[PDB]
Amino acid sequence: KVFGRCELAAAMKRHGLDNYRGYSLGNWVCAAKFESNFNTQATNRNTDGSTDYGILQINSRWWCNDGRTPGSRNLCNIPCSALLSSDITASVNCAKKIVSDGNGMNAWVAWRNRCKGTDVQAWIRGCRL
Numbered sequence: 001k002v003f004g005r006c007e008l009a010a011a012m013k014r015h016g017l018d019n020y021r022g023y024s025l026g027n028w029v030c031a032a033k034f035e036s037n038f039n040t041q042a043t044n045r046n047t048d049g050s051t052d053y054g055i056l057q058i059n060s061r062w063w064c065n066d067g068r069t070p071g072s073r074n075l076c077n078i079p080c081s082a083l084l085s086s087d088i089t090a091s092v093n094c095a096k097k098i099v100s101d102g103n104g105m106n107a108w109v110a111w112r113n114r115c116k117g118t119d120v121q122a123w124i125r126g127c128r129l
């Protein structure tokens with residue numbers, strides 16, 4: 001599913017992501033924009049063999065199991081496929097664990113490089129929330 005800007009902001013808020021760990025909704029939406037362009041089915045193979053899945057491109061080396069990432073962990077206790085679903089519940093719950101891991105949203109390289117320090121509020125502007 002390809003979410004719309006405000007549509008995703010609403011789903012994210014509905015799942016308690018807004019202001020989670022101090023990160024405003026704009027930040028999450030911005031990260032989703034540059035990680036998957038809002039496509040829940042987005043995947044990206046990394047040079048190390050791991051793979052990024054979903055709206056927030058959660059990686060398999062630590063967070064989900066895809067059975068093809070030697071020596072990896074599955075800290076979110078979910079098959080990586082669950083991160084590709086129309087329903088973002090799994091992705092949101094896993095993102096919550098990730099952002100609480102110590103480095104905040106910096107865990108999402110694209111967020112640091114393209115959202116961090118920017119006018120992220122712009123990402124939910126005009127949205128009926």
Ligand SMILES: CCCCN1C(=O)C(=C/C=C/C=C2/Oc3ccccc3N2CCCS(=O)(=O)O)C(=O)N(CCCC)C1=S
Pocket residue numbers: 003004005006007119120121122123124125
């Ligand atoms: C009627 C359909 C097209 C209208 N519509 C929009 O208005 C949407 C437009 C998004 C707004 C553009 C935008 O890109 C940004 C980049 C950085 C910061 C904010 C951004 N915003 C707008 C708010 C801030 S600003 O006004 O561009 O400065 C949109 O994403 N989408 C996707 C939502 C699909 C449900 C749609 S549908």
Ligand SMILES: [Cl-]
Pocket residue numbers: 065066067068069070071072
């Ligand atoms: Cl594996």
Ligand SMILES: [Cl-]
Pocket residue numbers: 021022103104105
């Ligand atoms: Cl933080």
